[PDB]
Design a protein around this ligand. Structure first.
Ligand SMILES: CC(=O)N[C@@H]1[C@@H](O[C@@H]2O[C@@H](C)[C@@H](O)[C@@H](O)[C@@H]2O)[C@H](O[C@@H]2O[C@H](CO)[C@H](O)[C@H](O[C@]3(C(=O)O)C[C@H](O)[C@@H](NC(C)=O)[C@H]([C@H](O)[C@H](O)CO)O3)[C@H]2O)[C@@H](CO)O[C@H]1O
Ligand SMILES: CC(=O)N[C@@H]1[C@@H](O[C@@H]2O[C@@H](C)[C@@H](O)[C@@H](O)[C@@H]2O)[C@H](O[C@@H]2O[C@H](CO)[C@H](O)[C@H](O[C@]3(C(=O)O)C[C@H](O)[C@@H](NC(C)=O)[C@H]([C@H](O)[C@H](O)CO)O3)[C@H]2O)[C@@H](CO)O[C@H]1O
Ligand SMILES: CC(=O)N[C@@H]1[C@@H](O[C@@H]2O[C@@H](C)[C@@H](O)[C@@H](O)[C@@H]2O)[C@H](O[C@@H]2O[C@H](CO)[C@H](O)[C@H](O[C@]3(C(=O)O)C[C@H](O)[C@@H](NC(C)=O)[C@H]([C@H](O)[C@H](O)CO)O3)[C@H]2O)[C@@H](CO)O[C@H]1O
Ligand SMILES: *[C@@H]1O[C@H](CO)[C@@H](O[C@@H]2O[C@H](CO)[C@@H](O)[C@H](O)[C@H]2NC(C)=O)[C@H](O)[C@H]1NC(C)=O
Ligand SMILES: *[C@@H]1O[C@H](CO)[C@@H](O[C@@H]2O[C@H](CO)[C@@H](O)[C@H](O)[C@H]2NC(C)=O)[C@H](O)[C@H]1NC(C)=O
Ligand SMILES: *[C@@H]1O[C@H](CO)[C@@H](O[C@@H]2O[C@H](CO)[C@@H](O)[C@H](O)[C@H]2NC(C)=O)[C@H](O)[C@H]1NC(C)=O
Ligand SMILES: *[C@@H]1O[C@H](CO)[C@@H](O)[C@H](O)[C@H]1NC(C)=O
Ligand SMILES: *[C@@H]1O[C@H](CO)[C@@H](O)[C@H](O)[C@H]1NC(C)=O
Ligand SMILES: *[C@@H]1O[C@H](CO)[C@@H](O)[C@H](O)[C@H]1NC(C)=O
Ligand SMILES: *[C@@H]1O[C@H](CO)[C@@H](O)[C@H](O)[C@H]1NC(C)=O
Ligand SMILES: *[C@@H]1O[C@H](CO)[C@@H](O)[C@H](O)[C@H]1NC(C)=O
Ligand SMILES: *[C@@H]1O[C@H](CO)[C@@H](O)[C@H](O)[C@H]1NC(C)=O
Ligand SMILES: *[C@@H]1O[C@H](CO)[C@@H](O)[C@H](O)[C@H]1NC(C)=O
Lengths: 490, 491, 491
């Protein structure tokens, strides 16, 4: 002789945060943040990266004799470099526009080394005495591999005139250099002429260099210096050289065969023989969630980065404002396993739990729609990129550093605020549905039943399981049971 | 004998989107996105722009013999330049700090050309014979028109000392240059002196230049090069020149008569003899909408730019919820309902007809109207993109500039879309509650004198004419006077 | 017989704004925007700042004879410098990499000046004739105090070879310079040799300089120029000099003893004897509010800067979707009620008095405060502006810097105003729901023993005293015990 309505409860212990409350327990939830990595360096889509162990970019390109296992390299997906490489320019000096060169290296996937000037093209100079103790090889003085140090022969240094014509179909990378001597006497011992120069000219290049003879402090046990330069040669251009002395000549060059997407990564983790689709300087990520907090700089197809600790979305009602879930209904039911809103009946034939599948489905579609919307709306988000600056560009370096942290905080704020508000609306949405269900039954049985305070109703007239289906379907005939009602209400 | 409550509906098919639902049909809506353009270039508030057809900025300042239609130029509003101009420095070379000069040129709206150093000032050098085949004019050798190339006369090149003292009350722009020779023999053929120099000095400038002699590849048929420099002279300063050879001397200069706001646009569209108030590289914009999606770079008064495809607001009821009235115990709207969003249908014995609830429609009208205005005002301040240029060796800075401007357009696009989704959700429920409140207001006044059907209508126990049913819509329904009569019929 | 329902009211006149409506009057509201400053410069945390009165950073480091008040300085917290320092570089010239030096100075809190090259280490050269009328001192020619201008003694200028080794366990700052003559004749008078050079070399430095001789315009009273350079010498490193003319030798250097956080401020305000925790160029702020609108650039712990004019958070309900309770079906509030926000008034035969409801006012107060704290917590991290300087030929980079920090301020301003406007709308709803939810509880329990009247209160046909009728606030009522006589009470 009773019909009652309620909601479904379970053993869940998930907890979400709203604007006005924290640690609220819900029946069903799913996390959307990734916090784990494998702690290794692994292949990107089946292509091994290029790992420069203890060499800088300059040491590899100029051919530092100490680390020369990189004489020939296959294709690479990205470049890995340590924080402070040990083997760099061995003879003290510098490389002009070092940072601008490394920006070019981030868009190249393959190099090919070719020989452009054989050593036989220096008949009137000495090509075998350019060794130095600052660049040792197996305990003996040596020098760089891709360049030649020319000194006088038979007490003379005739002027040099040479040219190269690019006949390939790709661009070339060329490097040369100049030497700064110590004193006037040392200048004549190496190159006979007392005043020297170097001039280089292409279709867009025009240069002249003069040595600086002065006194400097010892670096690696030497007081001399060497400066290096580079350029890109077009497929049908030519380059011309001319010098009197202090010249470091090119021997080998690089062809740019494949152009693509890559990065230079600073890390110290070991190679681990894997395959993956997302890589970070601290490890690899394998997940399908839309957010992660591992590291700001990544390569590949990755989830977006936020500086958060947790991000949980609620997909169920409050576990056990229209005042229905908390009030008029003390708590949920464990017996109603199937649905989310349902009925409980008390009858002479028996009792049981029944669920309203129609209203249950409407809620599932409504919330699943919302969840897929949050993933979509955050598709476009700031992606960090690495840039480098030298010691006299501190102003620009600071400007770059603040711009990237500025966007990181904006998107972290947006993600955290969005989760908080949608966790609140979901809980109100579930509450409203149960309130509307209560009214639907109430309007049908206008006077044939009385309210019992809680969700239950007690019937004036006697009925069996049949008209239980009538009320829940809405097919309750008020005039049919109009009699047997006034008699009870005596 | 019977009264009922309902809401207004029509035949519109406009659709909007909320956070929880998509393709929801509404009675009324509003669009806030502009997606059309003229496809032409027009005057900005009545000032014609300056079109450099196949001529670069450098080819216009230094007078390239081909770009001779720009000798005299009136006032302009903005400058239009093609992507890859054909006519540029004809003789091979470069212009120092080209990008910084273009940044300065974006704040100037008029110029005037004056003759600072007449050609009679050089009586011991050859003013003619400075032509070349790299700069042709009507099939004959020529040279830049705003500078002069000086060559030896009578096998001698005396040293030059000259000065100019600004007295025009406005700033001046001056250009000069140096020539690099091919070989040693060429140097003596033209200038007669083996070693040369150029020195220029002002209150803030101290410069010395030396030619470089080397072998270079052919460009435009010539292996020589020419480099040019520029400076700005304050209203009462002076400039001093001294040279031994290889000197390209100034002849004309520009006065900065007018200053203001301008820009340089890269486009290929054609002039349309029209007028406008907003201009984009792809066309002009006529609209009053808050947002647009034509192009990120604009000039003039313009709506804000977003990278979206549709933005529709909702200002009406859902057409055929949280408060369970619009689609709950009220099944649907009334087609015959006009003159009001919410109202009552009356069906007494004297007659039957519809009616409208005044002062319930009006509050909803005022409520939604203020919501729209607040959204427009809150988005007045938005990031505006501006063009900048960098050379081949500034790739790191150029990359940094591009990422900054794309980052801000992503943020503001996210803000605009989120606001529209949320306010649409509130508006739908705002209409839902107002119907529910009206339904409850009648139920309390009526009390037990009527029996509620359960569909949104009430059936009167006591017979009541249009006068007392008008009193229900007054809210002056007098329960006691009809209370006793309804009793007897109740049984 | 009567027990009505109502809500608390007072005489407040605070106003808040929502999305739907502006100037809503509420009982209690907070303010979270600070708008006052003292207008003086104070000590940051008990450390007085360094105030350069009429000098520049260059004038202080290279001792300008006028700026002799700053010969020895104590530890500072930040540096104050006027807009256009009058005393700067008495002898016309320039300082190389000026802006990069100032950026380095922003992370230093203390210097110590030491002597490295005594005057006695210059025999065979003249050390007392290097004075000029451009640096006047007490109306008699003088020169910078940290460098020496060397002139020929007898009629010769022997070459110089000097070296210094850093053995101080701390980094050093060293300055030197070169002099550009006016004429060949003037060159021989000061230094006998006609062709000169300067060579400087460290572990990471390799430089060579040559004078430029030309005619220039008069700045101050002189046509000569001087160029100065600087470097940082790491511990256990040496610097080597060599020249034969036009050399401005170092005499004093600065040690870097304390590193930390500092800044350089462009202000014209005056020093007042006070200490603070936040400092702006306009004044000092002393408050606990979350936001402020004084100035973008600050130092110390400070509220976040926004560009708004008013940020008021509503905390109490309005004073005399929308659940119909507060403004409808309950006309106005109660002035007499003071104990809580919501409560029950009663009128028994014995007397009439107001009462209060706990567990309801408690949850409303608990809810509102949690919302306020979460707003403040969510704004913990926000963009903070820093100062940077660029010279005259870096206009593109300077414009880029301005647009970036302007864009971030508009983004964070938008978030603050949007967050407030939405929570104001939600809060006024929250009180409305509580009023109606209470009304359901009382109506539900008195199912038929009471006759609802529609004004918010119930009339019991039945009679019982304060022990029972008031016993309904506790939530305990026995329907059966009073059902019989209520049923027997019929007409
Ligand atoms: C105290 C003293 O004078 N000692 C002499 C040695 O010089 C000392 O040791 C070297 C390592 C430096 O630290 C010196 O500063 C120091 O005083 C001297 O060794 C030779 O000194 C000369 C000085 O100019 C030079 O450094 C020599 O360098 C070589 C080298 O690297 O070993 C020799 C190479 O063959 C040569 N390569 C050529 C010719 O292409 C170069 C070249 O000389 C310079 O690099 C040019 O800049 O490097 C160094 O060996 C010793 C003689 O063996 O005599 C000691 O009395
Ligand atoms: C050597 C050969 O096979 N051909 C000779 C011509 O040179 C060839 O054609 C020219 C266009 C270039 O491509 C050369 O590289 C090529 O070998 C030669 O023509 C003259 O060549 C000289 C080379 O220096 C020079 O280019 C002359 O060009 C002019 C010019 O630009 O038009 C002539 C002008 O009158 C002169 N102007 C002044 C102020 O004197 C300029 C100027 O001297 C230079 O630009 C300075 O850098 O040069 C070109 O006519 C031909 C005649 O000698 O002989 C062919 O055998
Ligand atoms: C009309 C005329 O010719 N007047 C001569 C004076 O020059 C005039 O006034 C000076 C201030 C300048 O404005 C000149 O451009 C102007 O014509 C001349 O005064 C001296 O002129 C010389 C050369 O032009 C030089 O500036 C002198 O400057 C001094 C100074 O400041 O007083 C003199 C110092 O002793 C000297 N210091 C050293 C270390 O030598 C420097 C000087 O600048 C150095 O030579 C470095 O450049 O400063 C200036 O007094 C006057 C001399 O008798 O003759 C007038 O006929
Ligand atoms: C580099 O080699 C190219 C390629 O052969 C040469 O330029 C050629 O010049 C000849 C002369 O008429 C012509 O075949 C073409 O103008 C060029 N060749 C091609 C295939 O286009 C020249 O030797 C060098 N070019 C430069 C610019 O130095
Ligand atoms: C440019 O000429 C003007 C006008 O002669 C110079 O300005 C001053 O003019 C007054 C007026 O007689 C005189 O004191 C001098 O002729 C000038 N004095 C000064 C201090 O400049 C100006 O000198 C000239 N420009 C320069 C820098 O030489
Ligand atoms: C500055 O002087 C110090 C102390 O004399 C020098 O350091 C010594 O250098 C020599 C030669 O390299 C070594 O044998 C000593 O062991 C060093 N002593 C110490 C305490 O480091 C230093 O080299 C000098 N500076 C320079 C760059 O010449
Ligand atoms: C929420 O619950 C977790 C789990 O114990 C706890 O660590 C955290 O402090 C709680 N937060 C609050 C505000 O109680
Ligand atoms: C990623 O994780 C999934 C789930 O365990 C697994 O099936 C897949 O093999 C993993 N891929 C890699 C490359 O580790
Ligand atoms: C909404 O309507 C658009 C346009 O008619 C259609 O392309 C889209 O698939 C619809 N979305 C859904 C969820 O039906
Ligand atoms: C711009 O649009 C309006 C209508 O929006 C139209 O009346 C007007 O003629 C158009 N052209 C100009 C120049 O305003
Ligand atoms: C309706 O109410 C108004 C009071 O606002 C009154 O003036 C008017 O006479 C009423 N109409 C009828 C028919 O009673
Ligand atoms: C709200 O009231 C203030 C106080 O007088 C007034 O300045 C402001 O204009 C009012 N705003 C509106 C929208 O009425
Ligand atoms: C700021 O104001 C408070 C409260 O009036 C006061 O106690 C405090 O001393 C003030 N701070 C300073 C630095 O004067």
């Amino acid at each position: 002789d009773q019909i009652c309505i309620g909601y479904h409860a379970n053993n869940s212990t998930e907890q979400v945060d709203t604007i006005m409350e924290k640690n609220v327990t819900v029946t069903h939830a799913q996390d959307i943040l990734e916090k784990t990595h494998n702690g290794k360096l692994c292949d990107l889509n089946g292509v091994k990266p290029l790992i420069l162990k203890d060499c800088s970019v300059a040491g590899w390109l100029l051919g530092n004799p100490m680390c020369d296992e990189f004489i020939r390299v296959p294709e690479w997906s990205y470049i890995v470099e340590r924080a402070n490489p040990a083997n760099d320019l061995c003879y003290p000096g510098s490389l002009n526009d070092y940072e601008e060169l490394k920006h070019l290296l981030s868009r190249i996937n393959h190099f090919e080394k070719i020989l452009i000037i054989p050593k036989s093209s220096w008949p009137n100079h000495e090509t075998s005495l350019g060794v130095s103790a600052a660049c040792p090889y197996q305990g003996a003085p040596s020098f760089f591999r891709n360049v030649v140090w020319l000194i006088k022969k038979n007490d003379a240094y005739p002027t040099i005139k040479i040219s190269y014509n690019n006949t390939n179909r790709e661009d070339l990378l060329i490097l040369w250099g100049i030497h700064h001597s110590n004193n006037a006497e040392e200048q004549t011992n190496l190159y006979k002429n007392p005043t020297t120069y170097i001039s280089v000219g292409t279709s867009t290049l025009n240069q002249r260099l003069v040595p600086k003879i002065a006194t400097r402090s010892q670096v690696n046990g030497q007081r001399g210096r060497m400066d290096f330069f580079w350029t890109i040669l077009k497929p049908d251009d030519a380059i011309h050289f001319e010098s009197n002395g202090n010249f470091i000549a090119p021997e080998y060059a690089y062809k740019i065969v494949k152009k693509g997407d890559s990065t230079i990564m600073k890390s110290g983790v070991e190679y681990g023989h894997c395959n993956t689709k997302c890589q970070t300087p601290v490890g690899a990520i394998n997940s399908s969630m839309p957010f992660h907090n591992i590291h700001p700089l990544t390569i590949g197809e990755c989830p977006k980065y936020v500086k958060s600790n947790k991000l949980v979305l609620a997909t169920g009602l409050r576990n056990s404002l229209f005042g229905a879930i908390a009030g008029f209904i003390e708590g949920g039911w464990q017996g109603m396993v199937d649905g989310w809103y349902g009925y409980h009946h008390s009858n002479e034939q028996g009792s049981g739990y029944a669920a309203d599948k129609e209203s249950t489905q409407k809620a599932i579609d409504g919330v699943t729609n919302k969840v897929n919307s949050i993933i979509d709306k955050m598709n476009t988000q700031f992606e960090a990129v690495g840039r480098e600056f030298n010691n006299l560009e501190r102003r620009i370096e600071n400007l770059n550093k603040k711009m990237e942290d500025g966007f990181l905080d904006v998107w972290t704020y947006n993600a955290e605020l969005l989760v908080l508000m949608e966790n609140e609306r979901t809980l109100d949405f579930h509450d409203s549905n149960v309130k509307n269900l209560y009214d639907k039954v109430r309007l049908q049985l206008r006077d044939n039943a009385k309210e019992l305070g809680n969700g239950c109703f007690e019937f004036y007239h006697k009925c069996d399981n049949e008209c239980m289906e009538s009320v829940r379907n809405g097919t309750y005939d008020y005039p049919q049971y109009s009699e047997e009602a006034r008699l009870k209400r005596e």
